[model samples]
Target chain A: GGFSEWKDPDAYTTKIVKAMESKLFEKLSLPNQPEVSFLRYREQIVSGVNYCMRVKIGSDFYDLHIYVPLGSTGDIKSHLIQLTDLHLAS
Target chain B: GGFSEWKDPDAYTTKIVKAMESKLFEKLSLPNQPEVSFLRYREQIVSGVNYCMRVKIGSDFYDLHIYVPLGSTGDIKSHLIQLTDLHLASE
Candidate 1:
């Protein structure tokens, strides 16, 4: 498996989701509107983080995943604000 | 209804974004500080793209997104580029 790294779990999550949302909308040819939701799950025991997001577009559903560091923020904004740094190169 | 294809629309847009950002920053003479943002929207009848960015650090308002083929970059220098390609596995 390849290695992918990120610093500041919260920041990474927020950025990636934001990027995904932007890319998805344009591809689907939807309108320019902001209708997004986010869900974050943190495992204090294992020190792992999981994030899920859903976007609605005229009866269509678009889903996205967020990546968080083992030990990161546990607040609501931590869930919402961390999607500001997502970069995908394929 | 099980099919996924992202030949160029996905790749095409990605290339465009990078090309645009490179051109924009180069044209505007923005510093190589590596601040970026992107957003995208699509529909059966309408299609559009939006990007919001602020690179002042701790401003807490930098957000971005782009074109969804189903819908659905970078820099170095002291910043950790962590990437997580999420794959749905059945458990």
Candidate 2:
């Protein structure tokens, strides 16, 4: 339950995983590193439009991070990008 | 900073990763399932003492979930277990 109230966490989880299988993670590379196998799920609404989505996107030694604004964008392409914004341990 | 402020984010990351390489993740399996990998990191101070730790512990189609209170207990073995507790999407 949030201001934008994304009650159905499933909505976001399925959407994110679906996108990951697509080009969203097809070419994830960092500097001299290889393509990071990325898988994203979970929807914990943080603040207004901010949801902490679990992001595991590195190599076998993987991508572990949290994302702000990671849910319920009404299936719009532009808003979908905002929901996927993730952060690593820095 | 948090009330029980764990000012070292690197501390948690290194510790978790190191532990993963050892027996920590050696034999993770679910009910009638194969080995579930389970790599955990990130410490978001959710509440007074609760930290949201990022976890990916399943197969290649991985472990993506969040756990409250996933950090800073002076590196105690017992406390580490609590920090590692994760959740999955039921749907």
Candidate 3:
């Protein structure tokens, strides 16, 4: 199988990565090794977010990189919040 | 050739999509289809997080359910966290 682009780029990209590293990890009692990183780009007309993440369990390694656009709004605050809520519950 | 946008709108929507179904499909072991979705809206004096997902692999559909809040220092999590991590490792 392969990875596809997220539909709600601005909200899904920036918000989702932020939530994964922050909320979900905090709730874990046992520390699992999932290396996640996020990068952001912004301009007058557009904003962008990129992620490079690696997770290892036994002999298996999962590495993923993704980029999303913030569109015209370029507002990532709310999206981050939404992702946090989802992580806490899950 | 067709697909646009993915910067802060969650993470990297348009970019990685083009990467897989577009850029790296030739390298894929098996043919894959694109079926990903994202949804978001805001109304707050502060910050919060929310998400929903469903995936089907084999006869089992991975029903991933999740939500999160932004401000006031909450937990950070990734939803719809696809197990596609393995096949896409960078060389």
Candidate 4:
């Protein structure tokens, strides 16, 4: 809609988003829209990694934001992913 | 519980924990234990900041883990605090 500041989904983003599909539905209030399309994303490296993604759900566009924290444990299980903010695209 | 690896709660951790008191209760399954005591915390700078705090709730001990991410916008509102994990202490 606005100046497209988003990037095309890569293998890493695709895999991460896929893993969080069910979690997205569980936390989000969109009851009718179960299926979502991985449109594009913008990433920021804060304390860890921040992902701001634009997705399509039942013909409507929404922004999904998540934070994946960097870990020191060298264990994959210790990584925590957090949903920072979300909103319907204006 | 085990060897106490927790540090004394400082002004920063105290303030953060106070702000998240309600949130802790909201996500946690401890319905009967509304009141909690700020014991000590272990700080880890991960992708953001990880705070693992030991707290007392009705004579029971618990560990509260939260993640506070750093921000570029410098807007305090943009800082998302996440409850990463929680566990009851073992005897």
Candidate 5:
């Protein structure tokens, strides 16, 4: 798909759940574990894939841009995920 | 003066600090008390006043829109402040 528009997130895929709950997310140093709900995302193909996702925490909304570098193997778990930036949604 | 643009926040005024630390803010259900740094704000003249402020918590930033109704007296302490909404900041 083209990168110009946002796409609806998958229906709770295993990879999505793993990425959200991964240690990388915990590194944000949030006061405590937060319940997150992924809403929408846009993918930009680069050296790695850049995922700009909108997530909901409590009643507030946030936009989290993550980067997933290409791994040697196709296994999603093997890829190192990076949280580039995050901001409140409009 | 004018509501056309944002204005620099006051240098940690008593009213500002009190509003941020009040029970109205505590009702937001935050996991813990956050260290907030008020950055900028825009004011709208309403029945009371609407203050849209940008603040920093930890490394991330947020936009908090609060409304303060016209108090009976000039004392800021008597006003019941409301935390209307808040979100992560653009920057």
Candidate 6:
């Protein structure tokens, strides 16, 4: 919604939001809305090579957030594969 | 469990295990035991400031895995709040 200070954060955010939105909405399994509220975002190396996001829709909307990460290739980096929580940062 | 190729990975694994185990167990709240198994780890820049783990237990063990990441400061990078799945990598 706000202007992203970037050559890419601007592009990245817009593109990513769509990808993520579809993913969340398409299969979000909540007895409730299973809403995903954005809390933080990190585009490291400024390459979009590695993007980290802090999301609020952990199982049952647990207070402790789950760390999610994805790479420039559009492949997710995880340890059930890897990733983060941005807004919860100090 | 296997040998970590790091000065910190070893330390990080040992220490993080305690922290994560406590976190998982203390409030796991699964009808099941809610076990956590590590599938992968990336301690890049080799500094351990940023670490990535692929874990199991994505919401309900769904076929699609959730991505999770943490930073050098142990800060969680998320959008809803933040996080990942390891076992589902090839599953």
TM-score of chain A of each: 0.28, 0.22, 0.24, 0.40, 0.41, 0.24
Candidate 4 is scored at a TM of 0.28
- The candidate with the higher DockQ, 5 or 6, is 6
DockQ of all candidate complexes: 0.03, 0.03, 0.04, 0.04, 0.02, 0.04
- Candidate ranking under DockQ, highest first, comes to 4, 6, 3, 1, 2, 5
lDDT at position B90, candidate 1: 20
In angstroms, how far off is B84's CA in candidate 5?
0.4
What is the per-residue lDDT of model 2 for residues A1-90, given as tens digits with 9 covering 90 to 100? 222322333433343333332222333322343332334333333332222222232232333332222332223222322322323423
Model 4 per-residue lDDT tens digits across residues B1-91:
3222546656744444444434344554436635445555544343544443343434455444444455412134323555455456473
Using TM-score, rank the candidates from best to worst.
Answer: 4, 5, 1, 6, 3, 2
Q: Name model 6 segments beyond 4 Å from true.
A: A1-4, A8-43, A46-90, B1-9, B30-91
- TM-scores, each model vs. reference: 0.20, 0.17, 0.19, 0.28, 0.24, 0.19
Model 1 chain A: lowest-lDDT 10 consecutive positions: A41-50
lDDT of 5: 0.42
Q: Give the per-residue lDDT digits (tens) of candidate 5, residues B52-86.
A: 44434456555444444555222343235554555
DockQ-wise, the better of 1 and 3 is: 3
How much lDDT does each candidate structure score?
A: 0.31, 0.30, 0.31, 0.45, 0.42, 0.30
Worst 10 residues of 3 chain A by lDDT: A81-90
Cα error of candidate 3 at position B27, Å: 61
Question: Which CAPRI quality tier does the interface of model 2 achieve?
Answer: incorrect
lDDT tens string, model 3, B1-91?
1123322334433333323333323333324743322222222121232333332223332322233334222223334332221111111
Model 4: per-residue Cα lDDT over A1-90, one tens digit each: 022245776664454444433433455444564544555554444454444444343454544444445541213422344545555657
Q: Write the residue-wise lDDT of candidate 2 on B1-91 in tens digits.
A: 2223232334423433333322223332213432323343333434212222222332323333322232322233223222223233242
lDDT of 6 at A90: 32
Please report the candidate that would top lDDT against the real structure.
4
- What are the per-residue Cα lDDT tens digits for candidate 3 across A32-90? 63544333312122223433323232343333343443431223332221111111101
